[PDB]
A paper describes a structure:
The FAD synthetase from Corynebacterium ammoniagenes (CaFADS) is a bifunctional enzyme responsible for the synthesis of flavin mononucleotide (FMN) and flavin adenine dinucleotide (FAD) cofactors. The C-terminal module catalyzes FMN synthesis from riboflavin (RF) (riboflavin kinase, RFK), while the N-terminal one transforms FMN into FAD (FMN:adenylyltransferase, FMNAT). Bioinformatic tools for the exploration of macromolecular interfaces predict that CaFADS might stabilize in hexameric assemblies in solution, organized as dimer of trimers. In the predicted CaFADS dimer of trimers model, the protomers adopt a head-to-tail organization within each trimer that causes the RFK and FMNAT catalytic sites of two neighboring protomers 6 to be in proximity.
The overall structures of F206W, D298E and E301A CaFADSs are quite similar to that of the WT (A chains r.m.s.d. values 0.149, 0.152 and 0.251 Å, superimposing 274, 309 and 317 atoms, respectively). Thus, in the F206W structure, residues 200–204 in chain A and 201–202 in chain B from L1c, as well as residues 259–263 (in chain A) and 261–264 (in chain B) from L4c-FlapII, are not observed. For the F206W variant, the side chain of the introduced tryptophan was refined in slightly different conformations for each of the two molecules of the asymmetric unit. Both differ from those of F206 in the WT structure and in the substrate-bound complex. Moreover, residues 197–199 on L1c-FlapI of F206W CaFADS were displaced relative to those of the WT, contributing to the opening of the cavity where ADP binds in the RFK module. Noticeably, these residues immediately precede the region that stabilizes a 310 α-helix (199–204) in the ternary complex structure of the CaFADS RFK module that contains the reaction products, FMN:ADP:Mg2+. The PISA server predicts a dimer of trimers for the F206W structure, in which the orientations of F62 and W206 side chains from the two neighboring protomers differ from the WT, and the distance between the aromatic rings increases by 1.34 Å. In the WT CaFADS dimer of trimers, K202 and E203 stabilize salt-bridges with E130 and N131 from loop L8n of the neighboring protomer within the trimer, while F206 interacts with F62 of helix α2n. The mutation of K202 and E203 to Ala would prevent formation of the salt-bridges, while substitution of F206 by Ala or Lys will abrogate its hydrophobic interaction with F62. With the elimination of such interactions, the shape of the isoalloxazine hydrophobic cavity in the FMNAT site should change, as found when evaluating this cavity in the dimer of trimers assembly for the F206W variant. This conservative substitution apparently reduces the amount of oligomeric assemblies able to bind FMN and FAD at the FMNAT site, relative to the WT, an effect that is clearly overcome in the ternary complex.
Residue numbers in the entry:
A (entry chain A), B (entry chain A), C (entry chain A): 1 to 199, 205 to 258, 264 to 338
D (entry chain B), E (entry chain B), F (entry chain B): 1 to 200, 203 to 260, 264 to 338
Write the structure that this text describes.
């Protein structure tokens, strides 16, 4: 998949495309409908399936540093867009182009001149152009005879509107199971394992910037995977195997994620590690003794073992290769 | 109007004065009664109307950095004192003088030797001298035959005691209309417009230190005035005209004030700008899309247009020259 | 009393000891039972009474910087351990030794090889060894024929479990009288008096790090003692006399303690000062005038005078030499 | 004078203009030649004289946080531009436009489409468009028959090249006299007076100012100069009028960690200028920074700075060309 | 290769080993002699080659925050060790063990009890146990009949002693050529690419990296080198493959206050490497740091760095011994 | 000895006093002459010997944050004053009083009204009152018949002027021997011991102290000196008594950013002094600061500092005049 930064980077010789436009934060199940429709039409005509997306977040252009939290990083947005069949991602920076542009000139510049689009697929909530006056309905009429437009209703399921907004709310509530439900996969973060405490001490510590969306402080059951690597691994964990883990999300009074991998002793310093969240286990608490702390640690392991045993049975969610022991 | 810092700066040849003493933060309607009485008596005898005030706040002398928030800056206190006819302001720093001094020696030093006072006007809540043992009643008796004293009752109106304390409470509640009511004018702040976001982007951004009193975070209707200047102004705003504005007061997680001037495109970087608050519009909120943000922005403009149309009719409050459009 | 840091520092020629093991934070009344039993048995056999304690807090080894607040500093723990007759304190750093060690090897290494113990005294909540699998019951069986073990029930009094945890809760609630009740003495902090405001201004200002346990923000009645010194004292306070004081505990938005010594004018800059807490007086509040501030200051002095007059009558709590005036 | 941010803010009904393009930092005597040529042309043909300038600095666009120090603020660049008769300033942000543009495209879009220019005036060192490919020459060949191009040599005077660079160099060494000479005026900073060590005059300056680290300042030291209280109806504590240049000894310092300060000791006045906006003009270097160990020593040196200043300023008044119309200066204490 | 933290993590069923002990910072040509001897022995007798190394640095244990800069990270020390055939790394923390231990006790506990060693290999400068009492000699006398001891002289080559110290010295002056020569490879750092001034290429590097102050870096300046995108299935913006060394001009800077940066300008590609892990290999010094006052000047010097780099890298490819198997380098633009 | 903050704190029933006025920073041999004259007079006529001193430093009042470093703290100034028999210290804050006062007014208010002085003793460099107008001479003419004035020349000895300034100079270069000689005692700092790298002795100092940036410290380096545990009933970990001066090698450092540290390696003892107040006396410079790359090297140099210290301290004991009454020092390890 090509990734282009700004309209000028798009090849001039690209002759046909089917295009979808959004922030696409999280690439949730709504987002998947748009991508699915776009990919299929691209295949039909033998053109490229293009996603136009935005970075920085368009909200942060108008209201700096009050951008909504990033459900996925830009890099993961690319990975997800690819896994669903996107051929090219065009990334638009509104501080550089397409802000002052009118609905008419936007379609003309972006969709025709730049992307050579025969098809465009947007959500009903789609807006574009100076002061967001462009709508889905605008787009259908401005594209009359020029290109075909398919406007897709926002995904409603089980009485919940599935959007970036609702995924963020669930995450903020610590309800990762509903977030997972809206995303169509286990919510995850990835990052390098740092030195933590030293070398009840966690299998892995990671830190995330405050723009990263994360589950409420608390303890979750989930899976930890050492991303593909030739680097030596200290201990009895292997790369590319999803290992059962009790996960503590905390706030330095910058958010930390501490992972206790069940039934393994490893030290993951230096490695890049994926943490997938499955279910909530408990709220954060203060500890006043080593005894009390380990007691609670063990109850977390038991509850985690239980939740993940269930998770495995929903195998559309569960990883390919996992490691989960029946007991200690 | 002269401004003197400390007793030693007061001219030795000043032969007669009518004096009022207080913090005078905000110069609210109570404060105006004291100034009014003082100015009138000065005119009667042909003497100078003097305000004795204090900086730093006397509270911060005893309890550093737990001083009450400043309703007005010291500079604005001077401006307000002048606009009401004060001839001289004596500023007392209690870390330098008049702290260890007894009620008797205070009247002797400040009122007689320094100020040559024939009249003194204080509020009923007035205290002075070592450990604030001096009262209004003390002052009348210590001044027997030496100078005349007029003690003015605190202003009570509409079931509210009008004081610096109550103005601060209203501001903190986001109730600027009641604060305006107690002040006798639109509450305002002034300051240089800084670079903000770049060059839905606000007409002006200002920053204030944390000792400055400000309305609760939220959006207010008000008026913005470019203070007199020969500097070129980018855009279609003119100096000295009060322009209709939706005002956002925020906190950097130092307080910011962001102003959206209605129906104008200007950039006010470099200019000194007054922001007058008229009425509350809404609480702060997070935005998750550009669409949602602009929707709400437009409702704020509508509600603001409405509030200011009313404000103009209370013309004792409203500015001399304003700019308010009937619609977009 | 000897203080040894780590097992290697303990003299090799020490031939007999009676040993007690715990964090001992606060040396509360439960802790006193263990020490009492240990001291008595040491006297019986003519051996040394040893306390094994821990630093850093064992909790902070597993969960860095989420250690419980220190009721006493390590230095005060030593002082208290001594005042109750302990002959030697062995301080264990779990980041250096005794973490990976099994229950069996722990008793063998610490109690026998290092300490030459004929008696060991622990609380029922006592744990030891890798993953705290060692218990009081373990210890009795592993010590069969090797040394005698006396396991002491946690102290329950007046429906309250007396522990480090409960002392912290009381302190956090601002309930110093119950904390004092559980400690068996007035809760206190000690520290150098710093420059504060200048040279209603407090008799003394002290600052404490955020790991120090302190009463809730508010005003307390208590006693202030200038620790033994040959340094000149500014004012009419003498060292080693416990002086009546209204005490303000605050938070810089690092905790401060501001002390108003009743009926004295002293300046304690440079001196080391003990602050003992007796009872709660009021919550923190903002002040808006010097008048209001002094009014409240005076009510605090009255209420304090009252509480301390009562305190003196419970003379097991009250200091040897105090200073409390009947009135102003 | 109008100020437009971006080519999209330019009035669309602009039929004719004489344009000059550059960073214009400091508006030095070199820059004035460019502006002069442009204004004199515009004034001739009833058209508007436009300046195309750049904010943020093109270097900061390419090398973030490593741009040269600003000789003037953007606000002052506007004010100086207007003072020399420019009718419009167009501020280009290179992160937003005219960056990936070819020399040919740059001319058509900016100079024709946006500005509708009949004349253009640039420095011989002028480079434009992607990878600075366009030069003073490129401009002449591309513009044929459409608009007259006037290329102007960089100003050399007294064996010294007059550029933003040399001005920065002069300032940096504390040589304000050479900086002023290259600028065609007294170098100055403008700023609100802040609270000092306190209000009101054993020790205290008349005025305290702080400046960000992007602001070009003379080397740390003491200088002779003039302070002017910017126009205001707000009252002044002490015996100073607004809009009069007052003789001052000016101390430029750096903060222990934090930023630069400017402390002004106005000669033969006690006043406290907290609350006001103040212009500080530098005339000549007086001495390097020193450490003080006693109050007497500091007061002694203080009195020497007042004498040195008094003299240097007396010469500056006689050299008339740079001094202010109305001022205040006493021959002796 | 296994990694054990502390003597308690070592498999208890370890019957035979050839051991080498040292900080091993940088794994320079001196260190390789130690590892080589050890591996060649272990490989002979079917036993495991163990490295005993130390983290945190023994100096930081004795003098907190005053340890020498790390030539490589601990992660890279492991990777380099494994690359030379070490089977096990035992990481000793001196705050945790082997500190108050006597020479005699150190041998029995570590070398016999823990590691069950039949061979040991150390440098002539080797010191062990409490107060560094044990020396290369002590080791031989204590180990008699139990294990064979092979003491190896510090590597001298071309009149230069090859040690962590001299490597740090070389790096510090910007002499990467001598550092590489003493290392036996191109000096390198590894790190995630961060966001620059923005995404996508007037000014911007191909890649931006930041490094902590414990990381040894060449003196501030420009260098010729190779950048490699570490293995990944993640897509790459632009025309660059993972696992190919690409020619780059590399700029090493310090931050105004904060830390070190490494900016990579990959020759004849525009790509944006945000999100990837990137290895940057240093070949030769190109120039010292300079200040820029104009966009043209910076682009001019930029083009000169590309030429210098192109040449230096051409020589590095010919000197083959240190260059990478697969790479990308063009003779001209 | 009484301590009064402000003229209003002075007992109103003070009928007679001999007064000396000055900053008195460091209480050096010059200052002792002033105090001696004053005490010897007061002691004669049954009156109190008063010191008028100043806090904050008069320079910091005039030039905030640019006062000279404090040779001693205000606490130590009091203690030193009392040690030389001063009965009362009056601390004047120039932000609060005696600032706008005329020479004539200063005498009447402070010397007569407040202190009721019959004798006064000042240095020839003495200046008092608004704009330092009053000098040593002014004082004599204003005081006639009311109080006897004794002006004392600044102390010159061995071609060296003894002043706060020169003491600061000596300290700054690391020449504690000359500082001590000018002071008439071992220079010292006093402070609570903080936690080091940890508790208890491979590497670790006996004691760690930190000092603010207003505190005068010898140049970074190693020094010979004595450490004394200030009087206490609190237990001491290790084999050290309170109130005994113990031989120590003393390392003075600066923090990477943050502040100064003082680390004390007490000779032939292991003790941990966390929790105690400790006095550290400097005797002689041992060496400049160095960087360490290996544990052996640091221990080697460590042992050399112990030898150098042992010798220098042996000489200091023989020169008796400055050494302490009770001390602890061993001839060899």
């Amino acid at each position: 998949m090509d990734i282009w930064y700004g309209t000028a980077a798009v090849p001039k010789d690209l002759d046909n495309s089917a295009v979808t436009i959004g922030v696409f934060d999280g690439v949730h199940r709504g987002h998947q409908k748009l991508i699915n429709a776009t990919v299929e039409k691209a295949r039909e005509v033998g053109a490229k399936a293009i996603m136009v997306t935005f970075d920085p977040h368009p909200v942060s252009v108008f209201l700096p540093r009050r951008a909504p939290l990033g459900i996925t990083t830009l890099a993961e947005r690319f990975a997800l867009a690819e896994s669903f069949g996107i051929d090219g991602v065009l990334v638009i920076d509104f501080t550089r182009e397409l802000s002052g542009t009118s609905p008419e000139k936007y379609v003309e510049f972006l969709l025709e001149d730049t992307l050579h689009a025969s098809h465009v697929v947007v959500g009903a909530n789609f807006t574009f152009g100076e002061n967001a006056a462009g709508t889905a309905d605008s787009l259908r009429q401005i594209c009359q005879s020029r290109l075909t437009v398919d406007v897709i209703d926002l995904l409603d399921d089980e009485g919940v509107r599935i959007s970036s907004t609702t995924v963020r709310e669930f995450l903020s509530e610590g309800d990762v199971a509903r977030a997972n439900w809206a995303l169509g996969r286990h919510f995850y973060v990835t990052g390098p394992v740092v030195r933590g405490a030293g070398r009840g001490w966690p299998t892995a510590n990671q830190y995330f910037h405050d723009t990263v969306a994360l589950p409420a402080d608390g303890v979750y059951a989930g899976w930890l995977t050492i991303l593909p690597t030739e680097a030596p691994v200290s201990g009895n964990m292997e790369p590319e195997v999803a290992y059962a883990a009790a996960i503590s999300v905390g706030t330095n009074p910058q958010r930390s994620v501490e992972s206790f991998v069940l039934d393994r002793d490893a030290d993951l310093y230096g490695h890049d590690v994926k943490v997938e969240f499955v279910d909530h286990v408990r709220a954060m608490e203060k500890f006043d003794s080593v005894e009390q702390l380990l007691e609670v640690m063990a109850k977390d392991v038991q509850k985690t073992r239980t939740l993940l045993a269930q998770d495995v049975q929903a195998h559309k969610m569960a990883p390919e290769t996992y490691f989960l022991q029946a007991e200690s």
